[PDB]
Design a protein around this ligand. Structure first.
Ligand SMILES: Nc1ccn([C@@H]2O[C@H](COP(=O)(O)OP(=O)(O)OP(=O)(O)O)C[C@H]2O)c(=O)n1
Ligand SMILES: Nc1ccn([C@@H]2O[C@H](COP(=O)(O)OP(=O)(O)OP(=O)(O)O)C[C@H]2O)c(=O)n1
Ligand SMILES: Nc1ccn([C@@H]2O[C@H](COP(=O)(O)OP(=O)(O)OP(=O)(O)O)C[C@H]2O)c(=O)n1
Ligand SMILES: [Mn+2]
Ligand SMILES: [Mn+2]
Length: 1264
RNA sequence: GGGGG
RNA sequence: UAGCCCCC
């Protein structure tokens, strides 16, 4: 460690709280990181005096592996395939030798790539050559699922840990996290690699590059080493930063060693991934003596997902695990995969926890951080053949006799059907009618928003559409000469803009291109990039599904994103007396087929939508005639609406199936079109659709089936007390059945077990295999809960991991920084040990802050000052002679955050600056007599500040665009959007109205007329950048670094005029013995103190924020937050109502709605959060898990502590100031380490009035 | 672009 | 060729 100490000495102390941070040391540390050679990191690793406890037997078979050749074969269709041995799952990358297939690299003679000879033979068509190429390309792919070379993360860890234990400012003692000599993962990493390199001078087992992966030419290297090493590094970092129990961590290493010792690392990982969760989380408290859990009340209406904390629920034996024991299956699993030693140890330790508390949840969390974090990989061919093959077993089909004769592509489900489909059909029919009945549905704007949803910069099987169209002699415009990417639905929209639906209808049946996605702890999933006409025609399906979800059930719309996964719901559901069943449906997409679901859904919508859609087109789709054969004998023609025409065309596609075009670039010669009946993922209907069926069937079970299939009084009573509107929350195929508890305790476990078994049997009737789980735990949207405590899963957030489905190279340098910041933010949300995590993050950041640049022998270097990271959100450890660790990771981002940390030490800074020569006679309002301008330019604080705000990726705008084709394109886009003259007429009105009442007040008027331009830009910025555009990006960053400044942004200079007084610590908002988030306990002072004093966010963040906008949606391309900001700004700038009415007309509203919302906005008392947007202030993401609403309202006093001040008084017409002022106070409170404190407005330099004018100038100048 | 179903 | 839905 002397090697590390010498090279990063001063920097190490700067990030350990011992010495101040300085850009000079930081940049040198950066240069040192870049000058360190890979092999040096290993040499550094050798310098570590590892303890015996950090060692464990390493399997010799991890090095000696068979040839890959017996693991593959050519199938009947000539595709290269993986040959199974351990089951139908054994389709991943096998653990084999690989050096025999490599050619030494010219220069790195010890490293090699796949023999060019072998690929050439493979390309010629040689079976053996193809097999070898496939293996080589997929093994390479497996090794690319990381963000950057492992050595960088390791070096970072060495540098960070060289600082020793950290002194907690709050607890006033050093932490007791074992040093690296006790880190088993690192030891293994060094040994495994050393053993591989053997006598070779090169210590790296492989090199992650841009030109591709290269393997160390050693007979001991295996295709399984990259994944193994990647798991070890994560575990190594986590043991030091999450303060994980070392003994547990070793268990995680053993599993990984076993995975590398097996015949397939990924496969083995997939089969054993439940070990830690099953033997801890799902086995906790078989016995229970005490502890406390939350006591929440679910407010009304439950749909708001709003809860209120009511105290603590004392625990006792009464609440011990009552759910069935998983011991047997868990042990069988361990025995089957050679891990019974691990399962047994976990089972034993889990039993020792008889109290539910911080210690016990941290144990679970720790255990669950040890699961491999690799993104499983297998060839595309394998994913497609495993996911689009299995078909649902409909044990009780809809009788053929129950369908009427056809009505085009659909058949009505006779109302005399005794089938359970009866209910599924009624729900979709009902919702279809109500949806189509809504007036908004027939508003040109609404239909523009819908037509604009799928017009995006992402793909849409562009090539297949062009050819399915060529098949009927219809050639689309090619716009020869435009600098935009052609494979975008945006390009598609422009091509189709001026063609009647009848000419593009065939495209609805065009093939579907391949799209893949790798996941952690899961298998790769195939994706279907539907084309514009396919997405268009899917509208009715999507809208009806949305209507069901908004009006008929209890569901959360989104994908996930911590807190957006409604944390509050899990706390409630998992807290005794309450209990929850974690319902999930396997093979969801493959279970939604025409045989039972789609034929019924298509029918119900087609019919229920009839009367209100009659005699009318929809979203560009015309009405038409179709053959009618409903009645027997009677055969006529039937007029249907455009909406019905859509269902008509969509039904034709759902019936036939999807032609998936598979071009497997990892498997030479594996080109085939696979037909499948599995439901599309890339469809706008997918998510909402599955959510709707989920609740609909659960409703039918609880209302009909269940009751009719049992006479058991308790079960009948239990089911009767459950409602899909009050007790069942779902999204897609995930479900959470919440059984509220009584004073008599919780509902009988045996009665619950009966209900579940019936649900299970119930789904077999229509092809659904319910994955039900009753284990005393709550699991929803990959969020884990036990006894009201959230258990972050560190396993799913691989520090070094990064999904990479395609072969394309990683984005140019700059890009990596956003990823590193994301790694930091995940740690904040996962609750790692704040100091250890912050210090490590500074090391990591420093190690990626420098890049070598080229301009033609013009070898320079791009360096980001430490200050850029602060701007991005990374808190300072110690600066300007301040105490160490005074800054919390809840410090805001950007200007708000800069304001916060600077205000907390304004005086320290001023004093430091003067005592170091930065003095002047001019007395600064913020920094007194400190020559701040000279200081900030020299320290690179201004530089870093501005560099952080520059594009971290090449720009394509400015590419020579031949004006004529450029106008044709944007015209096509315009016609697509402005199809309906009514809409256009609306915007033109807003326009001339704007010139009279709004023009001049603000300069950011959002307008539908901009969309075509924003769409063009999007298609542009989607294309591959050139090396020139790259240089241009660097030059920009480098010019900002050279330039010298005299101030911060106009908004930051304005906030700095405001001063506060931090006062009394707040009282606890929740009980301090209450486990809310594992890892967030008295051992993690700042996070814990913030959680306790500020309080947890007990409402859904989606619901909360939906109340901070006047309009929820708008045409894709415009920014809802932008529209909201313009309206409020106009109001704040004294604009007349007619001006807001004009703004609203320009974004598509009818004059009546426009005038109404405008008049409504004028007289409204706007909330802190919504109002703060007038100046671009947003609630920080890191704050989302806390009760920031309460902080703004009751703990940021705008009235000075000692009464009113002339400067602090808020002018009559400037009440909007209070919202901005609330954010600034909150900033300082949240940025200060420790307990949330009450803060009092102390001063505003030039007074409130002048402050307001200052903000009003910023407002009216945006976009000039 | 980032983090997540 | 590389989809859809969400927090900044
Ligand atoms: N990028 C993504 C990720 C997920 N999904 C959707 O999420 C839904 C279900 O999620 P999973 O549980 O992850 O998919 P399953 O096929 O059901 O996996 P298996 O039963 O193992 O869980 C269906 C799928 O289309 C999606 O459209 N796009
Ligand atoms: N002032 C410097 C010089 C080099 N590098 C880093 O070095 C790496 C590759 O170049 P080297 O071959 O390692 O640089 P050398 O200067 O030739 O090595 P040193 O003096 O020991 O010889 C990439 C580049 O960013 C750097 O960050 N800053
Ligand atoms: N913004 C960037 C990114 C990369 N390059 C050029 O790309 C070439 C090699 O790519 P890298 O592998 O990304 O650069 P290295 O210095 O070899 O190391 P890495 O980015 O970790 O620093 C050399 C470098 O000048 C550049 O000029 N400007
Ligand atoms: Mn599922
Ligand atoms: Mn699921």
């Amino acid at each position: 460690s002397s090697m590390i100490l010498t090279q990063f000495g001063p920097f190490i102390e700067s990030i350990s709280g011992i010495t101040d941070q300085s850009n000079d040391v930081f940049e040198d540390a950066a240069k040192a990181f870049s000058m360190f050679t890979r092999s040096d990191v290993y040499k550094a690793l050798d310098e570590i005096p590892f303890s015996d406890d950090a060692m464990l037997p390493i399997p010799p078979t991890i090095y000696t592996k068979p040839s890959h050749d017996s693991y593959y074969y050519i199938d009947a269709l000539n595709r290269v395939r993986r040959k199974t041995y351990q089951g139908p799952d054994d389709v991943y990358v096998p653990n084999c030798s690989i050096v025999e297939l490599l050619e030494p690299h010219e220069t790195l003679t010890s490293y090699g790539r796949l023999s060019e000879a072998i690929e050439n033979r493979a390309k010629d068509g040689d079976s053996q050559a193809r097999i070898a190429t496939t293996y080589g390309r997929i093994a390479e792919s497996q090794a690319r699922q990381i963000k950057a070379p492992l050595e960088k993360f390791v070096l970072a860890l060495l540098v960070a840990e060289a600082g020793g234990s950290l002194y907690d400012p709050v607890l006033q003692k050093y932490d007791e996290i074992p040093d690296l000599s006790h880190n088993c993962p690192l030891w293994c990493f060094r040994e495994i690699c050393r053993h591989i390199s053997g006598p070779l001078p090169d210590r790296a087992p492989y090199l992650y590059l841009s030109a591709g992966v290269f393997w160390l030419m050693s007979p001991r290297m295996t295709s399984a080493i990259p994944p193994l090493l990647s798991d070890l590094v994560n575990l190594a970092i986590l043991q030091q930063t999450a303060g994980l129990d070392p003994s547990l961590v070793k268990l995680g290493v053993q599993i990984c060693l076993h995975a590398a010792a097996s015949s397939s690392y990924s496969w083995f990982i997939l089969k054993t991934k439940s070990i830690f969760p099953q033997n801890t989380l799902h086995s906790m408290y078989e016995s229970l003596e005490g502890g406390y859990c939350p006591n929440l009340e679910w407010l009304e209406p439950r749909s708001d997902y709003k809860f209120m904390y009511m105290g603590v629920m004392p625990l006792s034996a009464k609440y011990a695990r009552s759910a069935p024991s998983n011991d047997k299956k868990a042990r069988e699993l361990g025995e089957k995969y050679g891990l019974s030693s691990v399962v047994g140890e976990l089972r034993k330790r889990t039993k020792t926890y008889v109290k539910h508390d911080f210690a016990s949840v941290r144990y679970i969390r720790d255990a669950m951080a040890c699961t491999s974090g690799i993104f499983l990989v297998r060839t595309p061919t394998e994913t497609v053949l495993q996911e689009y093959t299995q078909s649902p077993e409909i044990k009780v089909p809809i009788p053929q006799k129950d369908w009427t004769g056809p009505i085009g592509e659909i058949r009505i489900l006779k109302d005399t059907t005794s089938s359970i489909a009866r209910y599924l059909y009624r729900t979709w029919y009902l919702a279809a009618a109500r949806m189509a009945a809504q007036p908004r549905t027939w508003d040109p704007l609404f239909q523009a928003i819908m037509r604009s949803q799928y017009v995006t910069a992402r793909g849409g099987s562009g090539a297949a559409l062009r050819e399915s169209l060529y098949a009927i002699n219809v050639s689309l415009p090619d716009f020869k000469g435009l600098p935009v990417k052609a494979a975008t639905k945006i390009f598609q929209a422009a091509q189709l803009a001026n063609l009647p639906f009848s000419h593009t209808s065939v495209a609805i049946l065009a093939d579907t291109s391949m799209g893949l996605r790798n996941q952690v702890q899961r298998r790769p999933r195939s994706i279907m990039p539907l084309n514009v006409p396919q997405q268009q025609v899917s509208a009715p399906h999507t809208l009806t599904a949305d209507y069901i979800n908004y009006h008929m059930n209890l569901s959360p719309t989104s994908g996930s994103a911590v807190i957006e996964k409604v944390i509050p719901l899990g706390v409630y559901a998992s807290s005794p007396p309450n209990q929850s069943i974690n319902i999930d449906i396997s093979a969801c997409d493959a279970s939604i087929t025409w045989d039972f679901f789609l034929s019924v859904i298509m029918a119900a919508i087609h019919e229920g939508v009839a009367s209100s859609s009659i005699g009318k087109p929809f979203m560009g789709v015309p009405a038409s005639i179709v053959n009618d054969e409903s009645v027997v004998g009677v055969r006529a023609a039937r007029p249907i609406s455009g909406m019905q025409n859509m269902i008509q065309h969509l039904s034709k596609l759902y019936k036939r199936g999807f032609s998936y075009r598979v071009n497997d670039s990892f498997s030479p010669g594996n080109d085939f079109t696979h037909m499948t009946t599995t439901f599309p993922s890339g469809s706008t209907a997918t998510s909402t659709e599955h959510t709707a069926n989920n609740s609909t069937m659960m409703e039918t079970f609880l209302t009909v089936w269940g009751p009719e299939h049992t006479d058991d009084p308790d079960v009948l009573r239990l089911m009767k007390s459950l409602t899909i509107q009050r007790n069942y929350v779902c999204q897609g195929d995930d479900g959470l059945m919440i059984i509220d508890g009584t004073t008599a305790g919780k509902v009988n476990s045996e009665t619950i077990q009966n209900d579940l078994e019936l649900i299970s049997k119930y789904g077999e009737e229509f092809g659904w295999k319910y994955d039900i789980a009753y284990d005393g735990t709550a699991e929803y949207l990959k969020l884990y809960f036990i006894f009201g405590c959230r258990i972050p899963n560190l396993s799913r957030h691989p520090i070094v991991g990064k999904e990479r489905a395609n072969s394309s190279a990683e984005e140019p340098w700059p890009a990596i920084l956003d990823q590193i910041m994301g790694v930091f933010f995940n740690g904040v949300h996962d609750g790692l040990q704040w100091q250890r995590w912050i210090r490590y993050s500074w090391a990591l950041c420093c190690a990626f802050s420098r890049q070598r640049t080229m301009i033609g022998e013009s070898v320079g270097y791009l360096q980001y000052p430490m200050w850029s990271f602060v701007y991005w959100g990374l808190p300072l450890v110690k600066a300007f002679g301040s105490d160490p660790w005074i800054f919390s990771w809840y410090m805001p981002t950007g200007d708000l955050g800069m304001y916060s940390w600077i205000s907390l030490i304004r005086p320290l800074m001023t004093r430091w600056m003067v005592a170091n020569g930065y003095v002047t006679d001019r007395c600064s309002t913020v920094f007194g007599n400190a020559d701040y301008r000279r200081c900030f330019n020299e320290l690179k604080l201004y530089q870093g500040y501005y560099m952080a705000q520059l594009p971290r990726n090449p720009k394509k705008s400015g590419r020579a665009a031949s004006r004529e084709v450029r106008e044709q394109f944007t015209q096509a886009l315009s016609d697509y959007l402005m199809q309906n003259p009514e809409l256009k007429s609306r915007v033109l009105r807003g326009r001339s109205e704007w010139e009279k009442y709004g023009a001049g007040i603000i300069h950011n008027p959002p307008s539908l007329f901009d969309v075509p331009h924003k769409w063009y830009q999007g298609a542009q910025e989607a294309a591959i950048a050139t090396r020139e555009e790259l240089a241009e990006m660097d030059e920009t960053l480098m010019r900002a670094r050279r330039h010298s400044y005299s101030s911060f942004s106009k908004l930051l200079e304005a906030y700095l005029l405001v001063k506060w007084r931090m006062c009394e610590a707040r009282e606890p908002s929740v009980d301090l013995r209450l486990p809310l988030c594992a890892g967030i306990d008295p051992l993690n002072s700042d996070p814990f103190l913030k959680m306790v004093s500020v309080g947890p966010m007990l409402q859904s963040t989606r619901k909360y924020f939906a109340q901070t906008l006047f309009m929820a949606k708008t045409v894709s391309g415009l920014d809802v937050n932008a529209i909201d900001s313009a309206l409020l700004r106009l109001r704040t700038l004294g604009a007349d109502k007619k001006a807001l009415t004009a703004q609203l007309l320009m974004v598509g509203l009818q004059e009546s709605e426009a005038d109404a919302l405008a008049g409504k906005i004028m007289l409204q008392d706007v909330n802190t959060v919504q109002l703060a947007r007038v100046v671009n202030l947003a609630v920080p993401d890191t704050w989302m898990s806390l009760d920031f609403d309460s902080m703004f309202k009751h703990h940021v006093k705008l009235l000075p502590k000692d009464g009113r001040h002339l400067n602090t008084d808020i002018p009559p017409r400037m009440g909007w100031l209070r919202a901005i002022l609330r954010f600034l106070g909150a900033g300082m409170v949240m940025t200060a380490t420790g307990v949330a404190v009450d803060i009092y407005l102390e001063d505003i330099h030039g007074g409130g009035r002048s402050l307001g004018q200052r903000f009003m100038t910023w407002m009216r100048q945006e976009g000039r």
